[PDB]
Amino acid sequence: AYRPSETLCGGELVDTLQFVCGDRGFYFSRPASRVSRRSRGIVEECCFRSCDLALLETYCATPAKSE
């Protein structure tokens, strides 16, 4: 189900990852990536850019302290 495309900001966009990351939790602060420099991080993108969704999908954290 979910929604179409939207934009949500700091705290509010936590809900995006909250729905796509899921049972593991997301990290927000992605480390480096494969572009030899840094990469995007939360809020500047759903708050300042757009919520590309796939983003939030990848913001999730499987190797997280399970509960």
From Swiss-Prot:
Region listing for C, in residue ranges: 29-40
Positions of region (A): 41-61
Chain spans, region D: 62-67
Source taxon at top rank: Eukaryota
Disulfide bonds: C9-C47, C21-C60, C46-C51
Protein name: Insulin-like growth factor 2
Region B, annotated ranges: 1-28
Effect of R40E: Slight but significant increase in integrin binding
Organism whose genome encodes this protein: Homo sapiens
Site location (Important for interaction with integrin): R24, R34, R37, R38
Range covered out of full length: 25 to 91 of 180
